[PDB]
Each structure stands twice: as C-alpha cells, then as structure tokens.
Amino acid sequence: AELLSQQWEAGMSLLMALVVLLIVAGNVLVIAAIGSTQRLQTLTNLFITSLACADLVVGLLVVPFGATLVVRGTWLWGSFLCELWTSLDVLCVTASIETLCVIAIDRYLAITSPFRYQSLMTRARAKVIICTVWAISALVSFLPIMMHWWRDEDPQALKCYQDPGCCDFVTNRAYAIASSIISFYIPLLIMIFVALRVYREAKEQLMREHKALKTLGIIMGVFTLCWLPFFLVNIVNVFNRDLVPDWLFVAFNWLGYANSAMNPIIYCRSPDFRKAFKRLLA
Ligand SMILES: CC(C)(Cc1c[nH]c2ccccc12)NC[C@H](O)COc1ccccc1C#N
Numbered sequence: 001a002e003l004l005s006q007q008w009e010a011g012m013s014l015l016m017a018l019v020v021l022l023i024v025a026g027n028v029l030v031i032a033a034i035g036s037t038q039r040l041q042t043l044t045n046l047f048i049t050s051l052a053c054a055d056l057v058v059g060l061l062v063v064p065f066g067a068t069l070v071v072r073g074t075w076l077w078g079s080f081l082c083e084l085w086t087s088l089d090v091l092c093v094t095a096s097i098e099t100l101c102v103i104a105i106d107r108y109l110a111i112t113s114p115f116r117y118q119s120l121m122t123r124a125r126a127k128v129i130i131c132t133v134w135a136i137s138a139l140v141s142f143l144p145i146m147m148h149w150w151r152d153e154d155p156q157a158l159k160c161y162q163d164p165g166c167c168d169f170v171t172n173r174a175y176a177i178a179s180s181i182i183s184f185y186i187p188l189l190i191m192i193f194v195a196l197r198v199y200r201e202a203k204e205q206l207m208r209e210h211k212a213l214k215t216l217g218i219i220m221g222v223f224t225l226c227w228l229p230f231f232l233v234n235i236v237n238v239f240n241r242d243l244v245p246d247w248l249f250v251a252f253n254w255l256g257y258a259n260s261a262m263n264p265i266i267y268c269r270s271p272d273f274r275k276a277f278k279r280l281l282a
Contacts, residue, residue: 009071014068021262023059024129026051033276040272044216046126047103050133054095062089063257070250075167082167086144093256094183095137100220101187102129104194107213111201118135140182150175173238177232184231188224195220215269222266226259 012063023204030052034040067084069075075082110117144150151161152172171179201215230252233244267273 006046012071013067016063016071020059020063020067021257022061022177022261023055026261027056027059029277030264030267031056032280033159033273036270036280037272038275040276043121043123043126044103044106044129044212046123047099047106050130051096051099051103051263054092054099055263057088058092058257058260061191062092063260066257069167073167076165077167079161079164082164083145083205086169087142090145090179090183091137091141092260095134096223097132097184097191097227098133098137100223101191101194102133104198104220106203107216108194108198111198111205117200138178144175149152176234176238180234182233182272184227184258185282188228189190192224212270213264218266218269219263222262223259226262229255230256 031049034045034049062085065077065081066089068077078086104192107122110121149159150169150171152170154170157170160170199217200212202210230249233249233252236244237249268277
C-alpha cells in the first residue's frame with residue numbers, strides 16, 4: 001500500500017509537470033510570437049494575447065496548486081491561499097469566455113461594417129476593452145469568493161471551512177447557479193449567437209481573412225467542449241447531489257484546465273505563427 005502511494009505520487013507528479021510545461025511553454029511562445037512579429041501584430045491578436053495571459057496564469061498558478069491537492073489528497077497552503085487560488089481559477093475561465101466573446105463581436109463588426117469598424121477600432125481602444133474584460137471578470141469572480149457568498153450553512157461544510165486542509169468548493173445552490181450564469185452561460189450564449197452570425201455573413205460576403213476566422217471558430221468550439229461538461233454537471237449537482245460521481249466532476253474540471261494547453265497547438269494551422277514558433281525555438 002505504501003509502494004502504491006509512492007508510485008501514484010511520483011507518477012502523477014510527472015504527468016502534472018508535463019501539463020504545466022505544455023501550458024506555460026505553448027502560451028509563452030504565443031505571447032512572444034505576437035510580441036516580436038509585426039505581421040502578427042493585428043488588433044485581433046491583442047485579444048489573443050489577453051487570452052494567452054489567462055491561459056498562462058492557469059499554467060503558472062491554477063494547475064500547480066491544483067496538482068498538489070490531487071497528488072497529496074489534502075490542501076497544504078493555508079485557508080487564505082485556498083481562497084485566492086479558487087478566485088484565480090474562477091477569474092481565468094471568466095476572462096477567457098469574455099475575451100472569446102469580444103473576439104466574436106470584433107470579427108462580426110469588422111465583417112458587417114468594415115468602414116465603420118476600421119475607423120473606430122484602434123490599438124488604444126482594444127487595450128481599454130481588454131482591461132474592461134479583466135475588470136469585470138475580477139469583479140464577478142474575486143469579490144463573491146472573498147465575501148464568502150459561496151459558502152453554505154450545512155455543518156459538514158462548516159467543518160470544511162475551519163479545516164485548513166479542506167479546500168473543496170462546497171458552494172450553496174444560489175451561488176452555484178448565479179456564478180455559472182454570470183461567468184459562463186450568458187457569455188457563452190452571446191458568443192454562439194454572434195459566431196453563427198459571422199458564419200452566415202462570411203458565406204454571403206479573401207483566403208487569409210477567412211481560415212484565420214475558422215481558426216477562431218475552432219478555439220471557441222473547443223473551449224465550449226472543454227468547459228460545458230463541467231458547468232452542466234455543476235448545475236445538475238444543485239438538483240441532485242448524488243447523480244454525478246466525485247471522479248467525473250474532478251475529471252471534467254481537469255478537461256477544462258487542459259483547454260489552456262490547446263490554443264497554441266490550434267494556432268499552428270496559421271503558417272505565420274508556425275514560422276514564428278520555429279524562429280523563437282532557436
Ligand atoms: C474551484 C473548482 C471547483 C476547483 C476545485 C477546488 N477544490 C476542489 C475540490 C474538488 C473538486 C474540485 C475542486 N473549479 C472551478 C472551475 O475551474 C470552474 O470554476 C467556476 C468558474 C466560473 C463560475 C463558477 C465556477 C465554479 N464552480
């Protein structure tokens with residue numbers, strides 16, 4: 001049994017270290033590629049940078065802390081770090097779906113109203129948009145957690161709050177529903193609605209302007225596939241606590257984490273990223 005534990009720890013630790021490396025390496029490349037290639041320095045890629053930072057924070061902070069919990073079965077970092085960790089987790093997935101939502105609107109307005117778009121949409125303004133996305137994401141994610149709005153009345157929950165080794169996100173039903181709707185479900189619907197409109201307006205309307213759009217359609221689709229299972233379960237868990245097994249919930253949350261390693265791979269469809277990747281890996 002002690003050998004089974006010693007194998008499981010060292011085994012998992014490496015899988016986790018591989019995941020961390022794939023996320024951090026992949027996204028640092030994307031930030032560097034854009035940051036040092038003036039062919040890639042478009043307004044749209046400013047939003048891709050923002051998105052890569054969100055995925056970077058997942059790789060440097062969210063998954064590391066999450067790994068120590070999955071390896072060692074308990075939280076080792078004190079109740080304050082548990083809260084700050086959870087806040088960063090919630091923050092990143094919120095900022096990601098909001099930025100993807102901006103990207104869809106960006107592409108739409110650029111397609112349907114190209115004269116008015118290109119005369120209004122500036123670098124200064126894309127930065128303002130990006131900050132506003134992060135400001136809103138911070139507001140919706142950080143505050144309710146620090147205010148303990150998520151916490152429930154149950155004695156078993158109360159037991160977990162006092163124990164600085166418990167870092168389970170046992171949330172009340174109101175928070176579970178509200179935070180899911182505000183952080184995920186609303187921006188997801190807006191994104192899908194706008195993305196379908198773009199897909200329609202693309203056919204009605206030029207190889208390089210397209211294909212890049214398809215790429216953006218992929219990242220949005222993949223994100224949805226990685227996160228929808230988690231948020232669906234999260235809502236089901238409110239109506240009946242026992243239907244979904246613990247492992248399936250934890251697994252789906254890890255699928256969502258995994259999404260942070262996927263974009264840099266998907267960007268390799270764009271040859272200019274591919275060339276910038278090859279140059280940087282000197
Ligand atoms: C914080 C938690 C539950 C990870 C976690 C932390 N401790 C746990 C113990 C057992 C299972 C999972 C966990 N997962 C957060 C997910 O990344 C998604 O988080 C969210 C993002 C926006 C709105 C609501 C949620 C939630 N819940």
